Amino acid sequence: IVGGTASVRGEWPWQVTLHTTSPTQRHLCGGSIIGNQWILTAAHCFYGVESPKILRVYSGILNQAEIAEDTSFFGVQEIIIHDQYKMAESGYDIALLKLETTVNYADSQRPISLPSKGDRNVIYTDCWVTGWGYRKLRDKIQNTLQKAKIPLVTNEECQKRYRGHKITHKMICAGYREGGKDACKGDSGGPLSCKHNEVWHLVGITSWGEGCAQRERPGVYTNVVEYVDWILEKTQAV
Ligand SMILES: O=C(N[C@@H](Cc1ccccc1)C(=O)NCCc1cc(Cl)ccc1-n1cnnn1)c1ccc2[nH]c(=O)cc(O)c2c1
């Protein structure tokens, strides 16, 4: 996160850090708890990932320093990537992780509500992006979970800023004209969380952008409301 501040412990209790153990253990991506056995994250996070056996999901984390060899985690049973996904910039950048065991909810870890199809008209004015990502394009993974408040941008406004791309209705954008606050490397897969009528909704998944926090270059997020049917289909048993 560029231009953000440290989070308070447990203030983003749906936020997880997804690690890979290969070749040695490290943070891979953000993600969001959406059900007892389910993390929602970005499809591009699994480039080259051959098996779910190398993944570990940590919930209820503020600082990466909390994670040691003796720290408990959730194993991943299955990675489900959208069958139309090819790469982040062309959309469908969405994946589900089915956990091996069930998350026991608490003040430190609980699910975020998916947006309702009826809230596509809502004008969200209290949206936050969070993660352990870089503070600048060339940087490193941060210890403490960062947060930054960022306004949504219209898809017409966003399309003018990315004339070499197709900004689709299945994407949503956020950022300041002057730049300064944005997701960056290591944040992808995490939430764009918007507070509306005292309830948080998972509006976007951190997906892509040209550089980090640049002038007239909004972050681009998977527009989660466009995938509630897919999520429902994919989270069904057998
Ligand atoms: O590049 C990373 N993440 C990419 C995504 C990724 C994931 C897995 C493999 C390859 C790439 C990312 O977050 N990408 C973020 C994409 C992005 C989104 C938005 Cl909304 C706005 C701006 C950006 N940009 C960041 N940089 N340019 N644009 C990444 C992920 C985990 C890491 N762990 C480490 O220990 C050290 C790292 O350097 C590191 C880097």
Swiss-Prot record:
Changing V16M: In FA11D; dominant-negative mutation that results in severely decreased protein secretion. Changing D119G: In FA11D; mild phenotype. Heparin binds at K160, R161, Y162, R163. Glycans are attached at N63, N104. Coiled coil: none annotated. Disulfide bonds join C29-C45, C127-C194, C158-C173, C184-C212. The active site is at H44 (charge relay system), D93 (charge relay system), S188 (charge relay system). Residues 1-236 form the Peptidase S1 domain. This is Coagulation factor XIa light chain. It comes from Homo sapiens. The chain holds residues 388 to 625 of 625 of the full protein.
